[PDB]
Design a protein around this nucleic acid. Sequence first.
RNA 1: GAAAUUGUUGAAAGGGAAGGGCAUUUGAUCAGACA
RNA 2: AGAACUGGCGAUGCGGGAUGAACCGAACGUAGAGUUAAGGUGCCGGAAUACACGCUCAUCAGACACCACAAAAGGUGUUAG
RNA 3: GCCCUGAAAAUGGAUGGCGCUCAAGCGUGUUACCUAUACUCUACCGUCAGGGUUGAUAUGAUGCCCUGACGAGUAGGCAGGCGUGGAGGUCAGUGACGAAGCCUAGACCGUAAGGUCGGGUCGAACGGCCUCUAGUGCAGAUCUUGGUGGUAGUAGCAAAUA
RNA 4: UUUGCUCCACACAAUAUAGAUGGAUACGAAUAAGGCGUCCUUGUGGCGUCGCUGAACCAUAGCAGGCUAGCAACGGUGCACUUGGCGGAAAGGCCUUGGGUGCUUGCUGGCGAAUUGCAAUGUCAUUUUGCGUGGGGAUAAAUCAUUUGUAUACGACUUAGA
Lengths: 127, 197, 96, 172, 49, 106
Amino acid sequence: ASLPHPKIVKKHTKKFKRHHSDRYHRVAENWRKQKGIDSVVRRRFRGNISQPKIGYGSNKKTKFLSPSGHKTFLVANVKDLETLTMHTKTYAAEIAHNISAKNRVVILARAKALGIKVTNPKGRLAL
Amino acid sequence: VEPVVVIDGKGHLVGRLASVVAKQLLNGQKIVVVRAEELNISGEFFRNKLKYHDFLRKATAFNKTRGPFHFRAPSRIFYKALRGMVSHKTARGKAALERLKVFEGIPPPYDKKKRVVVPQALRVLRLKPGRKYTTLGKLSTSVGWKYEDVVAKLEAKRKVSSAEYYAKKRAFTKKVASANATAAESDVAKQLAALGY
Amino acid sequence: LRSLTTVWAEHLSDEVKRRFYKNWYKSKKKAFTKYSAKYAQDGAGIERELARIKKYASVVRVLVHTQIRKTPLAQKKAHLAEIQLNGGSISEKVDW
Amino acid sequence: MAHFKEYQVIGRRLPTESVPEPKLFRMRIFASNEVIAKSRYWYFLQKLHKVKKASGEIVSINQINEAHPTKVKNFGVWVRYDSRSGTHNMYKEIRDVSRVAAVETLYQDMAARHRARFRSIHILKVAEIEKTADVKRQYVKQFLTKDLKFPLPHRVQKSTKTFSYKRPSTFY
Amino acid sequence: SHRKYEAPRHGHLGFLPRKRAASIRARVKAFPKDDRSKPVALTSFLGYK
Amino acid sequence: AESHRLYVKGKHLSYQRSKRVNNPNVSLIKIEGVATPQDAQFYLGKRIAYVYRASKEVRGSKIRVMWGKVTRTHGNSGVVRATFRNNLPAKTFGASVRIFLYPSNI
RNA sequence: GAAAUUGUUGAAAGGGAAGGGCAUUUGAUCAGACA
RNA sequence: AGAACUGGCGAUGCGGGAUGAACCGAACGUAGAGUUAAGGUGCCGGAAUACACGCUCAUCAGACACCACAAAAGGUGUUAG
RNA sequence: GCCCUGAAAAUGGAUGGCGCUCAAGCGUGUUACCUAUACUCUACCGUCAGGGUUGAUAUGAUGCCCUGACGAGUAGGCAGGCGUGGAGGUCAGUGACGAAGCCUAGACCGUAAGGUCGGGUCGAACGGCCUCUAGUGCAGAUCUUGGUGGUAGUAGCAAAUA
RNA sequence: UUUGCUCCACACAAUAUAGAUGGAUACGAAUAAGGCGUCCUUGUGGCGUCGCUGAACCAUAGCAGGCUAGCAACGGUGCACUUGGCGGAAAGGCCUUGGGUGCUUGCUGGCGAAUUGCAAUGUCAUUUUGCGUGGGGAUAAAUCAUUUGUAUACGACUUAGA
Ligand SMILES: [Mg+2]
Ligand SMILES: [Mg+2]
Ligand SMILES: [Mg+2]
Ligand SMILES: [Mg+2]
Ligand SMILES: [Mg+2]
Ligand SMILES: [Mg+2]
Ligand SMILES: [Mg+2]
Ligand SMILES: [Mg+2]
Ligand SMILES: [Mg+2]
Ligand SMILES: [Mg+2]
Ligand SMILES: [Mg+2]
Ligand SMILES: [Mg+2]
Ligand SMILES: [Mg+2]
Ligand SMILES: [Mg+2]
Ligand SMILES: [Mg+2]
Ligand SMILES: [Mg+2]
Ligand SMILES: [Mg+2]
Ligand SMILES: [Mg+2]
Ligand SMILES: [Mg+2]
Ligand SMILES: [Mg+2]
Ligand SMILES: [Mg+2]
Ligand SMILES: [Mg+2]
Ligand SMILES: [Mg+2]
Ligand SMILES: [Mg+2]
Ligand SMILES: [Mg+2]
Ligand SMILES: [Mg+2]
Ligand SMILES: [Mg+2]
Ligand SMILES: [Mg+2]
Ligand SMILES: [Mg+2]
Ligand SMILES: [Mg+2]
Ligand SMILES: [Mg+2]
Ligand SMILES: [Mg+2]
Ligand SMILES: [Mg+2]
Ligand SMILES: [Mg+2]
Ligand SMILES: [Mg+2]
Ligand SMILES: [Mg+2]
Ligand SMILES: [Mg+2]
Ligand SMILES: [Mg+2]
Ligand SMILES: [Mg+2]
Ligand SMILES: [Mg+2]
Ligand SMILES: [Mg+2]
Ligand SMILES: [Mg+2]
Ligand SMILES: [Mg+2]
Ligand SMILES: [Mg+2]
Ligand SMILES: [Mg+2]
Ligand SMILES: [Mg+2]
Ligand SMILES: [Mg+2]
Ligand SMILES: [Mg+2]
Ligand SMILES: [Mg+2]
Ligand SMILES: [Mg+2]
Ligand SMILES: [Mg+2]
Ligand SMILES: [Mg+2]
Ligand SMILES: [Mg+2]
Ligand SMILES: [Mg+2]
Ligand SMILES: [Mg+2]
Ligand SMILES: [Mg+2]
Ligand SMILES: [Mg+2]
Ligand SMILES: [Mg+2]
Ligand SMILES: [Mg+2]
Ligand SMILES: [Mg+2]
Ligand SMILES: [Mg+2]
Ligand SMILES: [Mg+2]
């Protein structure tokens, strides 16, 4: 359904994991810049891992766009859903995770009526 | 070009035959080297006797096993010669070396196969005449190789059964050329003649 | 050097047959029975085998074995071994 | 240096008010390009006159093409050079087709027989040996004898395939 | 440093290794020369000390 | 006939590389019987296919191909740089690649 | 009822450590997208 | 061990010098293409077993700045003077 | 000039290795070729700068739009942000038709800190946005307390007569 | 231990592949010398010839090569067979006889081919294994335990037991 847009180029799709996150259990993959003096990573000796930096920043056009083309949006009831009433080619609706079973089925229903996208439409669906 | 390429070693210089056998090998051309003992090395036989004895002392001190191994047969004096020019520790490396065989003399399969030369390692061409140089088998025999007498014995025997081969051949290709000239001057022949044959 | 063939006799003392085993008493002692065959037919195969040796064979050795039974040992299992032959002409050798 | 041209370079001290029309001096100069040549001019003339380019002026630079460029000639070369200990004077004879062809194989045979590099060398005079038997060094004389002939044995075909299937032959 | 008093080593490296042998029947590592001109006969024999 | 070949045989030599950093986005090709950079300028552009097999039948076959194009001459000996759709798998170094006669100019 | 750490099952690799970077073959697995 | 001017290293990766704080080259946002620096091109290794003219045969040859050494003195070895 | 003599050290061994002798050595000349995070052109990101534009009747004025240059970094400064415990206002937010938590080489957004969903397990609570507040972020500190390994089914279990 | 094994044949099914795609095309020796033809007195011989690259040689036309007729030859060649011989360096290959049979593009004919839509490798090699079939052929051992002491820390070794 999506609004037309450039080919989305992603610039660095791999996840930037922390230095030595792989080494000791206690170090979480969670990125963290190294402050050492001798740190081969910090100095950027060739062959160690790559560090997040602003050149890696995505294109100001395709930024945020998921595959479809729609900038997504957490939705929790129907009124929330309706904020997308006039932008079904720009935003999609992502039903919140806490949203009950029976409530989702209304929200979906209205999404269909309004013509609004729903990303996670099999969420707690009786089947 | 060919599936396999047999190289008569005779009159080739160790380090050059190597260098080329290396690259034939790394670009995936299966190569086998024969008559390895009849191989040459720059320098009078004695200098190369020496050079080899220096190679001989190099051995792991605490255990003469795990250290350098000293191979005597001319084929393997050639194989070392060759292994040095190959990234032999890597995959890629073992890969190539597998596509190679080195032989003193000319054993079965290979003696009925034709075998080629590598003009850029041919000694007679390469070396300056009057330079002193060195045969492998004689260098190898002087450093503990046990099998020179035997080799040149079978060789002499093989070199006989294959003169007969060539004799027979030379007579057949006489009739062949004899027959190919009773065809001379005829129409078809004059036609090919004109298309360059 | 490389073993090109052996050629064995026809009958074989249980003394040497013993050697080719580890649990004799139990086994069926089939050792050297299909070999003992090849004599049945005239000889033929045994012939060429010997004949092969002569044509080639640069050296020749005998397969002998101790008659351990005559020795006061308790062993039974006799001792088999190769022995070089150092007399004239390989062809004369195999005949011997 | 490269492949040499020969140059007539010409210059003169600048006009003074009291000395207009200075005396003008030339050199034949052996250089690979006109720039190196104008350099050498000053290099040498400064070793000879109260001048330096700053107080001087180039007046003409022209190339000098071989008299009879396909006439084999017998050159006698005179050279000052610098070894590792002292400086030195040499005469060598060179047989070749032009002054410009020789003066390269000169510089070459200095580079190789005495490891004298360009900077280290002064071409004092290159001049043709007119009448033979005034060839005095012998490796040239060796080539003046009548009905000279010589063969070129042990001939080498430079193979163009990695492998070959003959086994060659050095006949010629 | 260096020794103090040189004295000859122990043992004989020619007999290494000093493992158990790989069979009770030591091996005839070599045989007499051959002169094919004498009569043919054996070159050894089997025994019991 | 016996022959069905409509391409030239080529080996897959190296990646384009420095002395000690290689660059998989460009593969270097040895075209048979092409041994000078001039003899090589003929093949510039001619699409390259590297055929190979696998265990899983796919779109009906047990044969897949990666596809490329000769793009320039390499050095002084008719070696040749090519780029493919996906880069070539380095196990293929010294394997057989096929160079075609299209898009031709004769 | 997390982690360290352990048992079973399933898959994979391992010629004197293991882990990592760029790239791609292979297997497994997955989104989106068509209309 | 100590001063002067500058350029660096420290705080700095990238290419070359096999290796290396200080040398050569060049200073970094993420990338495509082209071309180069210094340094290379028998094979390891991308790239001429290219072209040319000499010199050198070492029973301890020689093989590239910083750089990982050698001198006096000698040779009827051989080269050009 | 090159080559030889002069030229003696301790684990086995280094023109970087193989190896090379009309060289793959020494000197010198000519061309071609190889490849840096440098140079040229283009795309994207960010930074700084210079212009444009409040005119309604629609959606950001700290905005919207054109354009040019630039981008290393320890100690250190500043900036814009991410995340936690509680507080004011709000969404008449979420939820026993399943809140919080936890597992999950399953999905997506971000350069990143982190954010969102799916499935599973679970059982009573809990979020978004504008503000407020601080006992507010861990890999270290021979760090505190607890818990757990490799060592390892190992050292051992042998004095005092049986 | 539920009909298990092996060699020859096909059948399905897997699984692999350092990388088929006309042919690895056989003297030896010399290199300041040789190859070949030829004559002879058979020699370190006479005469001639060639080289200067395999850019050769051989093969190569037919639905990835279908279905057919005929002439000329009496040749080639593929296959299963049979005769005699050779080859141990790793021989596992070479050669030769004789029938049978397919093909022959040596030459002349009849027919087919599209619609894979303008390219998409457009699939034709050989790897190892497993499951049933039926055509020959074959009916053992080793280990634990016990035991000896030519051996031994334990394993191991060396004996013995229908
Ligand atoms: Mg530091
Ligand atoms: Mg440190
Ligand atoms: Mg560090
Ligand atoms: Mg999104
Ligand atoms: Mg590899
Ligand atoms: Mg040959
Ligand atoms: Mg000679
Ligand atoms: Mg046999
Ligand atoms: Mg007794
Ligand atoms: Mg000058
Ligand atoms: Mg002492
Ligand atoms: Mg519980
Ligand atoms: Mg691994
Ligand atoms: Mg990857
Ligand atoms: Mg400086
Ligand atoms: Mg400091
Ligand atoms: Mg600094
Ligand atoms: Mg720097
Ligand atoms: Mg450099
Ligand atoms: Mg160095
Ligand atoms: Mg400088
Ligand atoms: Mg190497
Ligand atoms: Mg290369
Ligand atoms: Mg030396
Ligand atoms: Mg040396
Ligand atoms: Mg110097
Ligand atoms: Mg010299
Ligand atoms: Mg070293
Ligand atoms: Mg040295
Ligand atoms: Mg070199
Ligand atoms: Mg030069
Ligand atoms: Mg040079
Ligand atoms: Mg130049
Ligand atoms: Mg050129
Ligand atoms: Mg760089
Ligand atoms: Mg860049
Ligand atoms: Mg730019
Ligand atoms: Mg910065
Ligand atoms: Mg809060
Ligand atoms: Mg608190
Ligand atoms: Mg839940
Ligand atoms: Mg659930
Ligand atoms: Mg409760
Ligand atoms: Mg605190
Ligand atoms: Mg607290
Ligand atoms: Mg902690
Ligand atoms: Mg810690
Ligand atoms: Mg414990
Ligand atoms: Mg226990
Ligand atoms: Mg114990
Ligand atoms: Mg105790
Ligand atoms: Mg059964
Ligand atoms: Mg002959
Ligand atoms: Mg006669
Ligand atoms: Mg004759
Ligand atoms: Mg031919
Ligand atoms: Mg037809
Ligand atoms: Mg046909
Ligand atoms: Mg073989
Ligand atoms: Mg045909
Ligand atoms: Mg097919
Ligand atoms: Mg019984």
